[PDB]
Amino acid sequence: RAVLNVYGGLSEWRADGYLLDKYQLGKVEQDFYTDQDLSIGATINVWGRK
Amino acid sequence: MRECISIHVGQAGVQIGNACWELYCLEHGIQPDGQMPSDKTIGGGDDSFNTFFSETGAGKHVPRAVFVDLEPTVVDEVRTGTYRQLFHPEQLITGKEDAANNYARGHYTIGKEIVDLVLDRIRKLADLCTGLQGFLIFHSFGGGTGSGFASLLMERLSVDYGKKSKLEFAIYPAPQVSTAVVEPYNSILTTHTTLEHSDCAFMVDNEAIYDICRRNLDIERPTYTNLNRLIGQIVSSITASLRFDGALNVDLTEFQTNLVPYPRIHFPLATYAPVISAEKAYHEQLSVAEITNACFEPANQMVKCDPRHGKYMACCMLYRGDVVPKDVNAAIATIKTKRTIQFVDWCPTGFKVGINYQPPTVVPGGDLAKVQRAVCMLSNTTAIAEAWARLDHKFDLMYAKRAFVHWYVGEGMEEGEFSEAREDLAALEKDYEEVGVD
Amino acid sequence: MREIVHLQAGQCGNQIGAKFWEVISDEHGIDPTGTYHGDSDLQLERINVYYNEATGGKYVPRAVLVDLEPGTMDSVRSGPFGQIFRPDNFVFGQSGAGNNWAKGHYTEGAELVDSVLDVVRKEAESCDCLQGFQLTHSLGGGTGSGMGTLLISKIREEYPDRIMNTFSVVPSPKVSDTVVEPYNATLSVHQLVENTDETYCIDNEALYDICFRTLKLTTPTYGDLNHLVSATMSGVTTCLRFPGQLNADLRKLAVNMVPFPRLHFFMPGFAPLTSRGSQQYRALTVPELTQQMFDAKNMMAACDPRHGRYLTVAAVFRGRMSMKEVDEQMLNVQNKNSSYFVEWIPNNVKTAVCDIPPRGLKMSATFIGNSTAIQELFKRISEQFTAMFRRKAFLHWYTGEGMDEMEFTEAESNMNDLVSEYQQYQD
Amino acid sequence: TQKHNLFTPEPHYIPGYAGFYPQLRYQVGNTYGRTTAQLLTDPSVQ
Amino acid sequence: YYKIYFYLEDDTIQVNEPEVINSGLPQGTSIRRQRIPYPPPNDDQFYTVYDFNINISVVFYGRTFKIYDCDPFTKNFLKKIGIKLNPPGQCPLDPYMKMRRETLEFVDPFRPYQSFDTLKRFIQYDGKVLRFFCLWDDSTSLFGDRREFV
Amino acid sequence: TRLETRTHRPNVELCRDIAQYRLIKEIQEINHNVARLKETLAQAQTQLKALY
Numbered sequence A: 001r002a003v004l005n006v007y008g009g010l011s012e013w014r015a016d017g018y019l020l021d022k023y024q025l026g027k028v029e030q031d032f033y034t035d036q037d038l039s040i041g042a043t044i045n046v047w048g049r050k
Numbered sequence B: 001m002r003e004c005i006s007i008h009v010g011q012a013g014v015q016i017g018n019a020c021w022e023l024y025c026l027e028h029g030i031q032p033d034g035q036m037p038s039d040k041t042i043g044g045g046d047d048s049f050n051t052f053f054s055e056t057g058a059g060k061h062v063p064r065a066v067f068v069d070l071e072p073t074v075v076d077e078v079r080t081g082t083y084r085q086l087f088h089p090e091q092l093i094t095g096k097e098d099a100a101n102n103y104a105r106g107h108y109t110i111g112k113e114i115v116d117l118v119l120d121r122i123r124k125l126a127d128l129c130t131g132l133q134g135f136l137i138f139h140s141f142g143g144g145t146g147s148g149f150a151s152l153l154m155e156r157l158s159v160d161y162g163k164k165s166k167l168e169f170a171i172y173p174a175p176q177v178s179t180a181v182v183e184p185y186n187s188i189l190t191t192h193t194t195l196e197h198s199d200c201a202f203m204v205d206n207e208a209i210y211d212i213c214r215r216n217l218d219i220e221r222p223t224y225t226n227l228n229r230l231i232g233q234i235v236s237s238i239t240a241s242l243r244f245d246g247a248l249n250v251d252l253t254e255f256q257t258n259l260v261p262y263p264r265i266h267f268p269l270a271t272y273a274p275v276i277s278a279e280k281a282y283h284e285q286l287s288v289a290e291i292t293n294a295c296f297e298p299a300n301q302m303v304k305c306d307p308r309h310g311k312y313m314a315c316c317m318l319y320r321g322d323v324v325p326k327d328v329n330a331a332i333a334t335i336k337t338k339r340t341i342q343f344v345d346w347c348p349t350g351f352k353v354g355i356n357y358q359p360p361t362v363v364p365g366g367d368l369a370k371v372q373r374a375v376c377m378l379s380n381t382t383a384i385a386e387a388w389a390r391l392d393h394k395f396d397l398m399y400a401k402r403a404f405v406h407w408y409v410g411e412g413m414e415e416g417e418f419s420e421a422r423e424d425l426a427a428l429e430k431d432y433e434e435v436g437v438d
Numbered sequence C: 001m002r003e004i005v006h007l008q009a010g011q012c013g014n015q016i017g018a019k020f021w022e023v024i025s026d027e028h029g030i031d032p033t034g035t036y037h038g039d040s041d042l043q044l045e046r047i048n049v050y051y052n053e054a055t056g057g058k059y060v061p062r063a064v065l066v067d068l069e070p071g072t073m074d075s076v077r078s079g080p081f082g083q084i085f086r087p088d089n090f091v092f093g094q095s096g097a098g099n100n101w102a103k104g105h106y107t108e109g110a111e112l113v114d115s116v117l118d119v120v121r122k123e124a125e126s127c128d129c130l131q132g133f134q135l136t137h138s139l140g141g142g143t144g145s146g147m148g149t150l151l152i153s154k155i156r157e158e159y160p161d162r163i164m165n166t167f168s169v170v171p172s173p174k175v176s177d178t179v180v181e182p183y184n185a186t187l188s189v190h191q192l193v194e195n196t197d198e199t200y201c202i203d204n205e206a207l208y209d210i211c212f213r214t215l216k217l218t219t220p221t222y223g224d225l226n227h228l229v230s231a232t233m234s235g236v237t238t239c240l241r242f243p244g245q246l247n248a249d250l251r252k253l254a255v256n257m258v259p260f261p262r263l264h265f266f267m268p269g270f271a272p273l274t275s276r277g278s279q280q281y282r283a284l285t286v287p288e289l290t291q292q293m294f295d296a297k298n299m300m301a302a303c304d305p306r307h308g309r310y311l312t313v314a315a316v317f318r319g320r321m322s323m324k325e326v327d328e329q330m331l332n333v334q335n336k337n338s339s340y341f342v343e344w345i346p347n348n349v350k351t352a353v354c355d356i357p358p359r360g361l362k363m364s365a366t367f368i369g370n371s372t373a374i375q376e377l378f379k380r381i382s383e384q385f386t387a388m389f390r391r392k393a394f395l396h397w398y399t400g401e402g403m404d405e406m407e408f409t410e411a412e413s414n415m416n417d418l419v420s421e422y423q424q425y426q427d
Numbered sequence D: 001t002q003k004h005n006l007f008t009p010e011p012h013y014i015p016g017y018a019g020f021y022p023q024l025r026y027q028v029g030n031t032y033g034r035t036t037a038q039l040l041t042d043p044s045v046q
Numbered sequence E: 001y002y003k004i005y006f007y008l009e010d011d012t013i014q015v016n017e018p019e020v021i022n023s024g025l026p027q028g029t030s031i032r033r034q035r036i037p038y039p040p041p042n043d044d045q046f047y048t049v050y051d052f053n054i055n056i057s058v059v060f061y062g063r064t065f066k067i068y069d070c071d072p073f074t075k076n077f078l079k080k081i082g083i084k085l086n087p088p089g090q091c092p093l094d095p096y097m098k099m100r101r102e103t104l105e106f107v108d109p110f111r112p113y114q115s116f117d118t119l120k121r122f123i124q125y126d127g128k129v130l131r132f133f134c135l136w137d138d139s140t141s142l143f144g145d146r147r148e149f150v
Numbered sequence F: 001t002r003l004e005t006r007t008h009r010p011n012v013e014l015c016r017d018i019a020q021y022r023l024i025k026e027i028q029e030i031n032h033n034v035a036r037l038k039e040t041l042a043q044a045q046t047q048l049k050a051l052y
């Protein structure tokens, strides 16, 4: 997620508030091995394991 | 040899410093570079250019002029113009804050911690200088910032170097056009502070220069691009005698020892008479008689005073170009015979003549015209009493009703200075009335 | 060097700042994203008065946005320039306001103040030297008054050497919306007159009139209103960031403009307004700029000074003019009506001339005036407050908050003092 | 608006100016001249 | 954008502009219902229906317009009298107007948001697993040779 | 081109003679025939309209 600001520590009613956002900057690409690329015979790298 | 030191202050100052030094460069053939074309002139630093520039062993021409300002705007602009390479870097001194039209702010709150470097620079020019005849100060009495600072630094020079002359060339507060309400305040303060350390004073007025501009240069849309150029021509005329050679030469020493009658009063007025356009000068004639009649024409001066409501006592005529003394004396004698001119008795003669055979110059991209004969007039009169009368019957009302005084009592002063200034001015009027009395 | 930090207070000031900032940025050539596009040397230099510098050429505003309603700041962030604003300066509370000035001034502001003070002093130390602060807020809106009064009060003794340029919107003399507006406005103006030095007061009735006069589209939005007011403040700020043979500093203006400590109220005025077809039916000439500037219909802040008289005026032009035309125009107005001003002071005219015309035209202007014309406005609020106070309706909330009606009495006293001194001066 | 240039090629910036030089934060170099030199050497971002 | 009405009864022309909201522009009747002469190299004759096709240009008292559309009835009457249409053209987008009302539709809120969830997919595929086998070669390293993974 | 170029005879070297006369006549006939041809084109296209 991407929180915007916290207005809680001003006082103490809950464990503070978590205002959201609407543009989600900084979402960085990390692809992951899904079910698609699976077959008998292919290449898969596993932290350096060919 | 024969050299002076130049000081400009204020956004109003760098205005006319820019214009005047740009004019300066042409006649000595100074490209914005600082080094000359093929023909060799450099040496022991000894030829005409030396009187304004100090061409070092580098070959670059480095002016003996200091530009001090408290605002980064105009100093950044001038340092980003075309002529930037010439100027000495920290001879161009800048600050970050303004006096906000407050003379007290400009003299007290900020000026203290810059005059130290000012002193540094001025004495490290004075050491190298040789004759050091005089100072050339450029400011404005209605200074938004450059008033108090200028007064303080001229006081410091008065207390440290008590031998040379001090020349002031200021845009006087316009009589009936005022850019703010602070002008009577700052003007009266600066005048009453400087009355006893100033040596010779000249005031000019933009309204009158405007009237000339659309009277005989007949262009209704000029700007400072015109006005600063004209006043720069005036200063070129007043320094030609020191610059070049001539038949008979006259020095600012004599200017001081002659044009002032007696102490306190050191406030004459100036005029360049043959301000005329290219086409006009092209297809009409020029000679001594008409230009002298013009220089006595009252509407071509630069302060709204009526000479027939005043009276003359001093005149210094500079002729620049080709003349001979015979028709000179003819014309001056004819004017003396003429009657409407009202000489005070005390001067039987009042004329000092300075002739410099070199003709004045013309600037490319300009609107002036080819000149073979030019007359510059410097006369002291009594006609300017109306100016001080105006300013006092202005300031009285504001002192009566106590407006804007909070701004000043906040920055840390009292009303003693404000009061004392008006009796100083009153002394000025009483003395002028006495000298008008025979 | 000299910079400015902006305060964007209460819901009004929030959208005011939205329009204002996008206007400044769009004139100054920065994209919505953040990657400037090289066109203009001079803006590229003087950007530092407002915008600080991140890496890569992406510019952080020096503004602080505050409000209590999270949805307001959600919408502001949703606008095309939330991405040019920072979460760092987004601070907010949880409770709705109700636009109760006592609420804004004693209970929840009492703890909301500290954090905003800490953040603003962070940025104030980050920069080098400010001249003051410009505040955008409301006096008829609850949270703006209740918070900004405390804020200005405390910053006054934080740093006693800076200019409190204040920009407060004024309720309609024909419909006050918030029924407790008399109370809010009186309480707010009580501390306004003390802390502030210069204040611009803005009423939108004239905006509606001008929408029927020159905007001429009859189907407007508060966005268009913000367009106009943002342009006006742009004009007042232009002189600093641009060259020219003029003086720019707000202090250079104020010390010239105000004669006495208790004179603070000011009248924005604008320059050529162009209609449906006046574009190709108009010649933009010095006489007509002067005329339209001085025009009464053109005036849009409070009301016609026709009933009263002027004390001081200042005008800032922006274009390739000359000094002679403005001087002769000043003489023309002076001698056309040398009666409507005050014989006390001469030369009531103040001038500035910038050489950097705005984007889209070649010469423009802006007019600010101090005239004895706000008497009717605060007189109206006087009758409002008295005619309410005679039967203390709605006062149970304020008493439950916990103050006294005596404080109200001193507020009305100070208000009547302003009335009396304006009258006693002009007459 | 309608106007002329500034920050012409490298050789520039007599020391003394206030203001923001574009991309001025790589100053391990030391002289004002070399600072400005690399600054105008680096408009390459687009 | 303008409407042109041809009255055959007297062979006259009426031009108007449709009313658009938030125009900030004058509208209503443009040039009235009269005759119109050519520009002058010659003026005694006047315009006649025999020169009107789409995607052409006209001028009327120095006001140059370009035709881009017609009506079913117009097509009927032209394929009744004889002129041949060229393929119809294209009408552009007024920039100021389009920008301003796209800004005013930008000012048309919906209060949007996005979030996430796990439970339904989690339960749908709860407690299932795929099973698959593989091999890693190791004889690259001069100590290990093989090992098997699942 | 011909009538233009035969206009730079210095002093008395211009004769306004029969060549000039007939060249003017040639200009006349060119213009007149062009007019007739354009008229004929007009009739042709109108009756083609009728054919459609």
Ligand SMILES: Nc1nc2c(ncn2[C@@H]2O[C@H](COP(=O)(O)OP(=O)(O)OP(=O)(O)O)[C@@H](O)[C@H]2O)c(=O)[nH]1
Residues within 6 Å of the ligand: B009, B010, B011, B012, B013, B015, B016, B071, B098, B099, B100, B101, B140, B142, B143, B144, B145, B146, B147, B171, B179, B224, B228, C245, C246, C247, C252
């Ligand atoms: N020398 C000079 N004076 C000018 C020029 N243009 C206008 N002036 C006059 O010079 C005055 C400027 O003086 P000030 O405003 O006091 O300048 P300052 O005190 O150094 O500081 P600022 O408030 O920044 O201007 C103006 O009131 C004008 O009347 C110009 O180009 N050169």
Ligand SMILES: Nc1nc2c(ncn2[C@@H]2O[C@H](COP(=O)(O)OP(=O)(O)OP(=O)(O)O)[C@@H](O)[C@H]2O)c(=O)[nH]1
Residues within 6 Å of the ligand: C009, C010, C011, C012, C013, C014, C015, C016, C067, C097, C098, C099, C104, C137, C138, C140, C141, C142, C143, C144, C145, C146, C177, C178, C222
């Ligand atoms: N931004 C904005 N403000 C408006 C608009 N219309 C009216 N206002 C005024 O803005 C005033 C106050 O805004 P704030 O400064 O946030 O004041 P507040 O303490 O939140 O009190 P209220 O908004 O009045 O409830 C309101 O009282 C309205 O009178 C508008 O369309 N946009």
